Design a protein around this ligand. Sequence first.
Ligand SMILES: *[C@@H]1O[C@H](CO)[C@@H](O[C@@H]2O[C@H](CO)[C@@H](O)[C@H](O)[C@H]2NC(C)=O)[C@H](O)[C@H]1NC(C)=O
Ligand SMILES: *[C@@H]1O[C@H](CO)[C@@H](O[C@@H]2O[C@H](CO)[C@@H](O)[C@H](O)[C@H]2NC(C)=O)[C@H](O)[C@H]1NC(C)=O
Ligand SMILES: *[C@@H]1O[C@H](CO)[C@@H](O[C@@H]2O[C@H](CO)[C@@H](O)[C@H](O)[C@H]2NC(C)=O)[C@H](O)[C@H]1NC(C)=O
Ligand SMILES: *[C@@H]1O[C@H](CO)[C@@H](O[C@@H]2O[C@H](CO)[C@@H](O)[C@H](O)[C@H]2NC(C)=O)[C@H](O)[C@H]1NC(C)=O
Ligand SMILES: *[C@@H]1O[C@H](CO)[C@@H](O[C@@H]2O[C@H](CO)[C@@H](O)[C@H](O)[C@H]2NC(C)=O)[C@H](O)[C@H]1NC(C)=O
Ligand SMILES: *[C@@H]1O[C@H](CO)[C@@H](O[C@@H]2O[C@H](CO)[C@@H](O)[C@H](O)[C@H]2NC(C)=O)[C@H](O)[C@H]1NC(C)=O
Ligand SMILES: *[C@@H]1O[C@H](CO)[C@@H](O[C@@H]2O[C@H](CO)[C@@H](O)[C@H](O)[C@H]2NC(C)=O)[C@H](O)[C@H]1NC(C)=O
Ligand SMILES: *[C@@H]1O[C@H](CO)[C@@H](O)[C@H](O)[C@H]1NC(C)=O
Ligand SMILES: *[C@@H]1O[C@H](CO)[C@@H](O)[C@H](O)[C@H]1NC(C)=O
Ligand SMILES: *[C@@H]1O[C@H](CO)[C@@H](O)[C@H](O)[C@H]1NC(C)=O
Ligand SMILES: *[C@@H]1O[C@H](CO)[C@@H](O)[C@H](O)[C@H]1NC(C)=O
Ligand SMILES: *[C@@H]1O[C@H](CO)[C@@H](O)[C@H](O)[C@H]1NC(C)=O
Ligand SMILES: *[C@@H]1O[C@H](CO)[C@@H](O)[C@H](O)[C@H]1NC(C)=O
Ligand SMILES: *[C@@H]1O[C@H](CO)[C@@H](O)[C@H](O)[C@H]1NC(C)=O
Ligand SMILES: *[C@@H]1O[C@H](CO)[C@@H](O)[C@H](O)[C@H]1NC(C)=O
Ligand SMILES: *[C@@H]1O[C@H](CO)[C@@H](O)[C@H](O)[C@H]1NC(C)=O
Ligand SMILES: *[C@@H]1O[C@H](CO)[C@@H](O)[C@H](O)[C@H]1NC(C)=O
Ligand SMILES: *[C@@H]1O[C@H](CO)[C@@H](O)[C@H](O)[C@H]1NC(C)=O
Ligand SMILES: *[C@@H]1O[C@H](CO)[C@@H](O)[C@H](O)[C@H]1NC(C)=O
Ligand SMILES: *[C@@H]1O[C@H](CO)[C@@H](O)[C@H](O)[C@H]1NC(C)=O
Ligand SMILES: *[C@@H]1O[C@H](CO)[C@@H](O)[C@H](O)[C@H]1NC(C)=O
Lengths: 414, 414, 414, 414
Amino acid sequence: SCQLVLVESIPQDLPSAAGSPSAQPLGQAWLQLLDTAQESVHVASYYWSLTGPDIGVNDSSSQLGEALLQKLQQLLGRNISLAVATSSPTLARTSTDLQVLAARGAHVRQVPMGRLTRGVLHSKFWVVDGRHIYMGSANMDWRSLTQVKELGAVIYNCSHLAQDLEKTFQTYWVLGVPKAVLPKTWPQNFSSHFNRFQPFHGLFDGVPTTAYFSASPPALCPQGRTRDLEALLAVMGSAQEFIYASVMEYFPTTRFSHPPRYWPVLDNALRAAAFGKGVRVRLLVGCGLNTDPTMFPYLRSLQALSNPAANVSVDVKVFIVPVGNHSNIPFSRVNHSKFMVTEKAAYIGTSNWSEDYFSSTAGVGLVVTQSPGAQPAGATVQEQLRQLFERDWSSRYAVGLDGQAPGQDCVWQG
Amino acid sequence: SCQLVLVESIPQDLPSAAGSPSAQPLGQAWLQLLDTAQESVHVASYYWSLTGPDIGVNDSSSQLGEALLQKLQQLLGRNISLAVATSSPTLARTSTDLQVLAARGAHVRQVPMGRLTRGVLHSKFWVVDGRHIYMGSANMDWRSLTQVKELGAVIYNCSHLAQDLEKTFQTYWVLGVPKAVLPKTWPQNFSSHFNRFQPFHGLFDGVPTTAYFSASPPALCPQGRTRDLEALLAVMGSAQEFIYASVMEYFPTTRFSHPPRYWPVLDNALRAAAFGKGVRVRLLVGCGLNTDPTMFPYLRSLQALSNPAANVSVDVKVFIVPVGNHSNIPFSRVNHSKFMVTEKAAYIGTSNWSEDYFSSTAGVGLVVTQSPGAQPAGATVQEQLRQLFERDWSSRYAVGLDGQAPGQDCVWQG
Amino acid sequence: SCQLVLVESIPQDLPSAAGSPSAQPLGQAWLQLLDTAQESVHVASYYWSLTGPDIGVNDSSSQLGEALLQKLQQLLGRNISLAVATSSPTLARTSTDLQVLAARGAHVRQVPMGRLTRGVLHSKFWVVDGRHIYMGSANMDWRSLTQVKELGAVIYNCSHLAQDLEKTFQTYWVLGVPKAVLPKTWPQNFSSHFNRFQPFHGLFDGVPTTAYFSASPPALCPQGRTRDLEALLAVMGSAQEFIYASVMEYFPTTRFSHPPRYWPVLDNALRAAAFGKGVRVRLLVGCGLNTDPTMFPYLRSLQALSNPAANVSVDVKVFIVPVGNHSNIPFSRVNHSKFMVTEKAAYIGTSNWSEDYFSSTAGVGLVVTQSPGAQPAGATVQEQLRQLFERDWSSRYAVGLDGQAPGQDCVWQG
Amino acid sequence: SCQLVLVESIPQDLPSAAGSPSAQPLGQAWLQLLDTAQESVHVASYYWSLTGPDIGVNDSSSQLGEALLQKLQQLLGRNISLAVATSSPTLARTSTDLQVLAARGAHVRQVPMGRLTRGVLHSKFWVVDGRHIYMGSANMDWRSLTQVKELGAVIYNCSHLAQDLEKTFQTYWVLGVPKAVLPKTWPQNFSSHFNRFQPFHGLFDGVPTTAYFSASPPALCPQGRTRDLEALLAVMGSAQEFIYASVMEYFPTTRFSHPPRYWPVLDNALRAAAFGKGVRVRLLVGCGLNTDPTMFPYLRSLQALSNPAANVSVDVKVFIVPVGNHSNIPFSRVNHSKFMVTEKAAYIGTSNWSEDYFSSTAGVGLVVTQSPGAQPAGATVQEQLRQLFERDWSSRYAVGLDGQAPGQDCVWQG
Ligand SMILES: *[C@@H]1O[C@H](CO)[C@@H](O[C@@H]2O[C@H](CO)[C@@H](O)[C@H](O)[C@H]2NC(C)=O)[C@H](O)[C@H]1NC(C)=O
Ligand SMILES: *[C@@H]1O[C@H](CO)[C@@H](O[C@@H]2O[C@H](CO)[C@@H](O)[C@H](O)[C@H]2NC(C)=O)[C@H](O)[C@H]1NC(C)=O
Ligand SMILES: *[C@@H]1O[C@H](CO)[C@@H](O[C@@H]2O[C@H](CO)[C@@H](O)[C@H](O)[C@H]2NC(C)=O)[C@H](O)[C@H]1NC(C)=O
Ligand SMILES: *[C@@H]1O[C@H](CO)[C@@H](O[C@@H]2O[C@H](CO)[C@@H](O)[C@H](O)[C@H]2NC(C)=O)[C@H](O)[C@H]1NC(C)=O
Ligand SMILES: *[C@@H]1O[C@H](CO)[C@@H](O[C@@H]2O[C@H](CO)[C@@H](O)[C@H](O)[C@H]2NC(C)=O)[C@H](O)[C@H]1NC(C)=O
Ligand SMILES: *[C@@H]1O[C@H](CO)[C@@H](O[C@@H]2O[C@H](CO)[C@@H](O)[C@H](O)[C@H]2NC(C)=O)[C@H](O)[C@H]1NC(C)=O
Ligand SMILES: *[C@@H]1O[C@H](CO)[C@@H](O[C@@H]2O[C@H](CO)[C@@H](O)[C@H](O)[C@H]2NC(C)=O)[C@H](O)[C@H]1NC(C)=O
Ligand SMILES: *[C@@H]1O[C@H](CO)[C@@H](O)[C@H](O)[C@H]1NC(C)=O
Ligand SMILES: *[C@@H]1O[C@H](CO)[C@@H](O)[C@H](O)[C@H]1NC(C)=O
Ligand SMILES: *[C@@H]1O[C@H](CO)[C@@H](O)[C@H](O)[C@H]1NC(C)=O
Ligand SMILES: *[C@@H]1O[C@H](CO)[C@@H](O)[C@H](O)[C@H]1NC(C)=O
Ligand SMILES: *[C@@H]1O[C@H](CO)[C@@H](O)[C@H](O)[C@H]1NC(C)=O
Ligand SMILES: *[C@@H]1O[C@H](CO)[C@@H](O)[C@H](O)[C@H]1NC(C)=O
Ligand SMILES: *[C@@H]1O[C@H](CO)[C@@H](O)[C@H](O)[C@H]1NC(C)=O
Ligand SMILES: *[C@@H]1O[C@H](CO)[C@@H](O)[C@H](O)[C@H]1NC(C)=O
Ligand SMILES: *[C@@H]1O[C@H](CO)[C@@H](O)[C@H](O)[C@H]1NC(C)=O
Ligand SMILES: *[C@@H]1O[C@H](CO)[C@@H](O)[C@H](O)[C@H]1NC(C)=O
Ligand SMILES: *[C@@H]1O[C@H](CO)[C@@H](O)[C@H](O)[C@H]1NC(C)=O
Ligand SMILES: *[C@@H]1O[C@H](CO)[C@@H](O)[C@H](O)[C@H]1NC(C)=O
Ligand SMILES: *[C@@H]1O[C@H](CO)[C@@H](O)[C@H](O)[C@H]1NC(C)=O
Ligand SMILES: *[C@@H]1O[C@H](CO)[C@@H](O)[C@H](O)[C@H]1NC(C)=O
């Protein structure tokens, strides 16, 4: 009886072409998920900024996030367990949401990924009632609800996947105990049940579906849990027609370490897929006022492989979100979606493509494969993701690596 | 008392800039080497086309090659042992020089390389009297003498390295026995004694020198010998100032295997050296009428990584040779040099840069490092190689990847 | 409503101890299954020797088998489809009943497992009307009905498990097509919805039950299916109290492949369960006048780990069958049972415990778990299996590895 | 110009058979090695019990050991550097040798092996002057000179191998810094030159030789350093004629961790070598008054594998050293030799065969290999090791596992 719903958030002043595909709004889905839950809610988030004053800005668009916060407090009014795991080196330092929720009675246990693996807790997911889950790239932020284009999935009335996500969250929580040390081998309970070798089978809305999860870094991977890097390489290798991807940043290197090293695993996998199998490879990387200008040379190197004569297609584009009058809001107006679409599978993750997110920084990934069902009316998850990717690609907000019109509000060359 | 000298052959009608550095001509070196022989001569060659009419053309430029054959016959007139190892799939099918030598009393032997490992005997080297060696990419052909640019190195009075090369020559010779198979483990007879970690040390002309050899494929590499790919990777990694490489063909893919695959080992090593260590990388690729156009996209990728601001500088150029009134010579007017020079070593190879060369075909490389001696003397082999590379790079015959002049000669986009 | 019952065949002239547990006779269950058929019958078998003179023997003990064939023929007299899959290198090459059934109208496909995976179709299961199901270590042979002791399980009125085994039989049937090749990936139709971590739940006669299937080799194992080896290792590892096992042949080495190699997976699992978890281990191998004596030392290698002080308890015994006057029946009077019992689960398979049965030779097995329900009168299936194993263990026909004596029927080296 | 010679220590009152092979005494070899020391001595040892009063006994057999200390003190009288690394959980808690040496001007660092990975520093070797090396199974104890049979190898005048071992000693030394932690990746300074794939190649007294070094635990192995476990696995797999192994204790299980686990890697490799290749396997374990009885059944398992008719020959014996009058000395009269000789290689180790010695406890191992060369008269190292092993095997102190004669000073069943 498992149900799967693609959810997404279009920011303000971003109209789409007529007839373009759309999914459920993020705010409505989050409100419905919070209302449905009646036993307990477990959230794994990088940071918490749900109010305008938390950042230090005052704007009407924050209202939605504020409402969500109120709903959370309303959840505390019905005596519902609420456990939060957040990275010790969190981003928003002046936020006070966690203190208010703790005062209301919500347990919050900071997990120090900075001391253990020299990274951060980038995972973002919800497990409510042990029956419904949500997983996306959306932080617990009003910007992610109203000012940042975002994507994710929500699974309803599904038990085993909820149990697996609960296992991962329990690993995070156990690590969050004060004065903790990485175990050499995780206990029996933390072992994952579904892997890429034996994915979880289900009847989603009446159609077959094989879905599984993946975790990172390798230290936080219990027995039987696929690494998110391994899942990415698997969904790349199994491709035979095309590969579409959309990430916020793409560096084939190590970002924050010393000395920096070249990390070609994803780049090599993409090139091998494009060459050996002759699959159409498309990349759509978001851009904004805060993106690192040094990413572009690697993108140009990737696109230089294009050669229709020899059956190579590695087209690459940058997604541009106009800033408009929202210049006061920091770290906003960017495309934060991270996902991959294939004719066989579909990957939704919460980590960028860099050595840190697969070596040190924690993260989770979800792989879904929906075979066509008896009723052809219901489009598969792969088809919906591909349609969304095509809508993003054909839109005027995406430009080629050569298009550098002055009115684009991006760093470009720095 | 080893004496190592760099040798090279410049095709006619290819003048260089005034004051350009130059090495000893190849014809003189080969003539002197054949003149000094008094015990035996061993040669490993891909094909034999010394006679002008062999190919099917008549020209004055082949006269030099004829002389070489005469000298070989003169050797057969002085009771000098002569052994030849030739690949079973020879290129020049219409070859009669081997028949003439065999009739005179040679010891030719066809190595069934294609039957064994689906490759060819691309190794080309000379061992004279078990004391002198010659190693380069010049197959026995007058085109390499007068119509193809070529680089190599010869060593005099260096018995240890001569025996080391005799080891792999004996490997080829044993494999050349009719109805032979690849041994599971090579006997101690063919075991080497100098490798990358314990190179042959000596005083070359009063200058400290560490030199060693390589081999390929690993199936044909006996115990104690470094694979050519391993030597190339070591030379790339150990570099800290620059890497100047020149090859006729550069392919990060399997060349003739089916199905095609992506083999990024050399590409990954080059990118990692350029980025992590911040070393200047320059590549020079030969460009002739027979060059595969599909090679150009990959090169362009390596060119796109150039980011001078972020301490990542990679440059790629194509070296073309004007043809003019030299159209009747086939498979000529190409830059056949295959070598690499860093600030700490110098590698001279006889094989191109592709997966098949380092995994299926027979290839051999030589690595030489010359420390600055106490006496001023002249310049190290590294300095001479760097000077030759700079002269070629600054020449009018080397153009950028985007500099496709209409009056040029190479294939370019095909 | 699913009714799962165990069945076993007691060989003629093989009395048991007074007041010993038993189960439903195999012949009666097979007759009931053939009588209740109304739509179709699908059979997967290794060979067919229903008739007595099929193997060239004139004995009354074959009469029962003859009757079965008669019933089968009567089935084809009621316009009921009959699908049969047999191994191409089948034993008893003088088989004639298969030709008779094919002439009467039964579709027969000979799976070429010999040329496909270098194995044989050792799997023997049975599907009736897509609703009833049988599986045991009993070939369609008269001597397997009255001269040889085996054990199997038959489930009545269970649709989902019947359809899963129908999917496996459809895999075999598709492979039986002339000029067929191994599919690298399997269509969605050949996909099991019940695996080890997601078994089929049911209320068999009230008591809850979790049952799932396993198939081998992995080449013939479709997506979502559990490999036999995986199921065996899972049941061995899950056990915390005791492990009982009965297999005709036990070899930790490859049997028919070249060159012979060690395959210690099952040995290692048994030893680890015995030592690390302190699990009592009892093993019962079979004996026959045609048995490989080289199996015996390995069993002794298992027997030596019998230190009661260190909480390591491993016992191994052999089961002899008195030949009596039945010396004229080839390949008979052998313990054919292949099953395994723990305190929590029960595995019933159609494969021996060598390497080839899990890499090349096809086989099928079932893992069933029954927990006590509201009514404790009905003993769990694991308890019945343990009772049968204890009856066999205490039988006079079972002797330890030291109980060699005159008059035994084992090969006993030689 | 490297020289290799085996050196063994024969206990007091242990007369071997007349005309038996033998090598240099341990005490004289150590004294000569210390005399030849001129620059620095680096010693890695488990503990120090040089003097008799260290334990608290009064025996004349300690004389030699005390003299050794005197020699060491005389070394410190010549202003010679002396660095010693010992395990933090050392055995002899009363010894004052380290304190006396530190008073005289030594350099002692207590490596916190117990806290880093829950193990001990079982490695024992000497690096003298950076040119000579020694390594065996001898601790810095007088009990190791006149009361415990031991074996090791000493090498003179070999700079490369000495530097290779000095790299491991430097790893231990830097781990001995207070409050130090295990680095994620060891720097290039600790990278090993020679490993399994490219062993050091040299000429020992005119005999060609290949030799390398192996270290454990996996965590303390830098880049390019082969691990002891994989070294043993490869040496045993490459065997084709026989494998003669001698050790103190043989546990295919975890030794002192919790919970206990089965560790069959060495047992599986032994059985695979015995069966697949049909090699002759001989195992000789040393039993003393402190031997754990639980080892005996496991060995019996291997002895139960014997089957001459099937080309599977395995034999196991035990070595009993009579106590005689030497009953007051604790942990004495035990065969401490740990080595293994095959027809192609000879391995001399430091750690026993158990899980902890290859996962947590740190040890070092050497794999030498000599082939006939310019001095065929001189017996190779493997020949000498085989001769010593056969001398021990044929000695009256070697008793089969079935041998349970009274009066033997071995625990037996306990
Ligand atoms: C998840 O399960 C719940 C409980 O079965 C579903 O809630 C029911 O939905 C049906 C159809 O809309 C209603 O007629 C019932 O009244 C609902 N019951 C309750 C108690 O709310 C729900 O529809 C399922 N799917 C989701 C939540 O997406
Ligand atoms: C590039 O892809 C095209 C197909 O888009 C290939 O064209 C082939 O044409 C032959 C002619 O009969 C047919 O086998 C198919 O139409 C095509 N084959 C495949 C495998 O698609 C073309 O050969 C490809 N070029 C390459 C791989 O270099
Ligand atoms: C070495 O060279 C000499 C000089 O030519 C050879 O001598 C003559 O060689 C011819 C042809 O082989 C023979 O017919 C004569 O009989 C030889 N004369 C004498 C007196 O030797 C000699 O044969 C050569 N030896 C070889 C073949 O190595
Ligand atoms: C290699 O060694 C040979 C001798 O085996 C050298 O030849 C001699 O060189 C000296 C010095 O130039 C001359 O005086 C002798 O007349 C030479 N003798 C012969 C027989 O040639 C040679 O110079 C050395 N170096 C090389 C060949 O480069
Ligand atoms: C590129 O490399 C150069 C030298 O390798 C870097 O120059 C160093 O810059 C740092 C800080 O900017 C100084 O502390 C050093 O003294 C400089 N060293 C030298 C030799 O100039 C330069 O910073 C690098 N550029 C980047 C962007 O990393
Ligand atoms: C290691 O090398 C040294 C120096 O080559 C050897 O020392 C010499 O040994 C010879 C042989 O007895 C003596 O005649 C010399 O007087 C020694 N010279 C010095 C300076 O000591 C040393 O013997 C070699 N090692 C071994 C074990 O022989
Ligand atoms: C055990 O091995 C030996 C030798 O490995 C076998 O003896 C013969 O060895 C030769 C050597 O090439 C073979 O050609 C023969 O086929 C082997 N057998 C015979 C009967 O001569 C010996 O047979 C092996 N034992 C078994 C039981 O196979
Ligand atoms: C600025 O913030 C204040 C609260 O401090 C709020 O009352 C006011 O409306 C805000 N101004 C805006 C949103 O323009
Ligand atoms: C929540 O718990 C408090 C505890 O005192 C109780 O007073 C209140 O009624 C509870 N609210 C519920 C169950 O909705
Ligand atoms: C795992 O779960 C908890 C601890 O997280 C506890 O019951 C025990 O350690 C394990 N047991 C189970 C349920 O597997
Ligand atoms: C090639 O040389 C000249 C070309 O000028 C020509 O006259 C001659 O006949 C040719 N040689 C042969 C063998 O045909
Ligand atoms: C092998 O070595 C021996 C010993 O030196 C030698 O006599 C023989 O010629 C060698 N054979 C080959 C083919 O190298
Ligand atoms: C080609 O032309 C140049 C000058 O135009 C001349 O020097 C050269 O000799 C010609 N080549 C031949 C083979 O005649
Ligand atoms: C089988 O044996 C019975 C008993 O003697 C005999 O009557 C019958 O003819 C025999 N049949 C055959 C086919 O031998
Ligand atoms: C059953 O099969 C018989 C034999 O061919 C045939 O005559 C009869 O019509 C069939 N009945 C049905 C209902 O198909
Ligand atoms: C799979 O089943 C569907 C539904 O019955 C059917 O349409 C299709 O033909 C089947 N395909 C194969 C390969 O059996
Ligand atoms: C045949 O079997 C019966 C029953 O076991 C036995 O009484 C009789 O003596 C046997 N006869 C032979 C031929 O052994
Ligand atoms: C050791 O024993 C000897 C001989 O009995 C005795 O002279 C000496 O004093 C003893 N030493 C100690 C420390 O007991
Ligand atoms: C050691 O050094 C000290 C002072 O540095 C000096 O007094 C002594 O003589 C030296 N000993 C030797 C043996 O050189
Ligand atoms: C590595 O070794 C070099 C020279 O041997 C030395 O200068 C450097 O300090 C060393 N670094 C480390 C980290 O040991
Ligand atoms: C051991 O004691 C016996 C009996 O006193 C004696 O004969 C023998 O020599 C002693 N052995 C020694 C002291 O090594």
